[PDB]
Design a protein around this ligand. Structure first.
Ligand SMILES: Nc1nc(CCc2ccc3cc[nH]c3c2)cc(=O)[nH]1
Ligand SMILES: Nc1nc(CCc2ccc3cc[nH]c3c2)cc(=O)[nH]1
Lengths: 377, 377
């Protein structure tokens, strides 16, 4: 799988993309790797922010499905025209395949001005695949049409300009140290999992188990932040705040309403806590824990148009769709989406940003009771 | 105040704007009326989506304040350069004034491609005025520098193309029928108020009082939706769902993940509930209630690029910053922001969209105990 190592590029806060080709003859496009949705979509008209776009007129193998698709957000959106053509992945496995494709033809706040990607790859499951679950996701199609094993893994590094590896087909043991630990995929819609216990530094939020996964905890290459629900963000942030009382910072800052700054080589790593999420483990009453440094949740804002100092942003933030384990968490770890086995594995990333003191860990086993009672229904 | 009647234009879901002039000689710009923030900001560089922009080079009366300003969102943002020049409002009161102005010089997902506004007018209070409360908001400046009375009112109509009236200086009794009822402004930061009871159709959500204002209920001309917190959105939506069991609709729809449709002249108003929020009243244990129809929370998506039927959207949605009473609620009513008296008044809007059956109401007085215990602290 060295072929596939280092095959993801991207820029800070704009997401990770992989090169794919679509249609015969092949039209290359950078597509954004997204474990939080289940549609394969490309810009198909000359939107001014796109470097490239799907020109269906140049592909012999295109096939309209005479149907629309209207994916809204809060408040982005995109809409398009379902077709099917032959997709391939240059720095991936050596299979071409025929998958569905939404040709994006109108959109709001979807494309990012100054990014180098022209489309999304939704690697989650049919159940959330708009317009409805009849729309067979790419990865279901890739597996169903080849010998390629039903899994993929992701090592998102991020150094400005970011990089990583999407190993389609298996695991590459050069991307991680220590051992992989597995939390089961609770249901095949998003990559939904269950945090059974949350510590900041060691002392946990003694919160009711259910509040960590209200109404959902998911793993998302497509979200930037670690996103906690309101009740829990409230809780975590207070313990983070108390933790962090070598100093004071503005109120808004925490709610992602300002940046905070120090000078080159002059930031306090160690005044800030390590965080640890315990995820449900493979066995009854067994769990394990993954631990992030503040390098992961304090991420620099690169080009700030009125600032020369180190102005990092706070990467943890609130929600109502649930916990979203974004690049903040995922950049700590080699993450394996074992779809074959309804489970996600976490190991210490061979490229995560560690200092001389602390470090990211994946550690187990621990004993946790009533892990199943931390779902919501 | 007829001078000021009908002085707001806008387009569906894109917001309400009023014409202002900035600098000498005066440069006209459409600015977006926003009760949810406290900064006056104009695009000052040729962003491709702007019709117009502040050219400080043409104004004698400009004055740099040699300071930046970096307003992020989730995940829009803008940043700019604080100055001060002479603002006026053509279809407003006949005063020119010297207020602060952030010249917006970089931004992300802030301006709307295809809108006709080039700036924001933040009519809330200094406390939330970025970069900090020393930045005197326009309206504080307008009052402090003229005889203009410390209040304004808003009648947002929305019919496509929307319209309304911002009466700066007082109230115009032609804009409402019945009587005005006043909920007090709890703190002068946002226009924060307190919902003491919530019904759908009549039967309330029997929810703990605090969950309606966790952590905030505000009144926002700048938000489109009625936005409830997660716990309460969960609650309301279930009662809305049960209410609405003459029919079934997709799961996503409710979470603003799809549109829903019927044919021209063929939509079920009456299968859907009226909603009623009870707001804290002026006297101890006294409250009143405002009531919206489904015309207010079911708002048409205008030009849909793969649809000919009536496809309305669901205007109620979740949050973690709190309740946000947006154009959904505000379009029902003539809303008076009596800043002089730390209070907001609600009357039946002379332009709200009512059918022959039901109608929007403002009704009181009711008896409600422990209204003060519905805050959060
Ligand atoms: N997992 C996702 N996918 C999306 C759509 C793709 C997208 C759009 C913008 C950005 C910015 C950074 N990553 C992005 C991904 C939205 C979302 O809410 N969750
Ligand atoms: N009250 C506000 N003001 C803003 C900024 C202005 C704005 C931007 C986009 C739209 C779309 C519809 N109305 C808008 C207002 C953001 C926000 O979250 N709350």
């Amino acid at each position: 799988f060295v072929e596939m190592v280092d095959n993801l590029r991207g820029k800070s806060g704009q997401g990770y993309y992989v090169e794919m080709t679509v249609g015969s003859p092949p039209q290359t496009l950078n597509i954004l790797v997204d474990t939080g949705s289940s549609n394969f979509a490309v810009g198909a008209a000359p939107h001014p922010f796109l470097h490239r776009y799907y020109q269906r007129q140049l592909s012999s193998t295109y096939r309209d499905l005479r149907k629309g698709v209207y994916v809204p957000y809060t408040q982005g959106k995109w809409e398009g025209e379902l077709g099917t053509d032959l997709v391939s992945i240059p720095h991936g496995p050596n299979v071409t395949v025929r998958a569905n494709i939404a040709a994006i033809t109108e959109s709001d706040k979807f494309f990012i001005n100054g990014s180098n990607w022209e489309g999304i790859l939704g690697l989650a499951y049919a159940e959330i695949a708009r317009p409805d679950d009849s729309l067979e996701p790419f990865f279901d199609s890739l597996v169903k049409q080849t010998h390629v094993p039903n899994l993929f893994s992701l090592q998102l590094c991020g150094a400005a300009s970011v990089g990583g590896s999407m190993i389609i087909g298996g695991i590459d043991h050069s991307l991680y140290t220590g051992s992989l630990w597995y939390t089961p995929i609770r249901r095949e819609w998003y990559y939904e999992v269950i945090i059974v216990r949350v510590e900041i530094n060691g002392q946990d939020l003694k919160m009711d188990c259910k509040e960590y996964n209200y109404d959902k905890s998911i793993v998302d290459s497509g979200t930037t932040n670690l996103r906690l629900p309101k009740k829990v963000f409230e809780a975590a942030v207070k313990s983070i705040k108390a933790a962090s009382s070598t100093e004071k910072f503005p109120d808004g800052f925490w709610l992602g309403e300002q940046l905070v700054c120090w000078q080159a080589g002059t930031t306090p790593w160690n005044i800030f806590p390590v965080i640890s999420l315990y995820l449900m483990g493979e066995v009854t009453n067994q769990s394990f824990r993954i631990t992030i440094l503040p390098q992961q949740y304090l991420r620099p804002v690169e080009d700030v148009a009125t600032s020369q100092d180190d102005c990092y942003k706070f990467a943890i933030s609130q929600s109502s769709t649930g916990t979203v384990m974004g690049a903040v968490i995922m950049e700590g770890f080699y993450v394996v989406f074992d779809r074959a086995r309804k489970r996600i594995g976490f190991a210490v990333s061979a490229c995560h940003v560690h200092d001389e003191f602390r470090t990211a860990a994946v550690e187990g086993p621990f004993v946790t009771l009533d892990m199943e009672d931390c779902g919501y229904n």
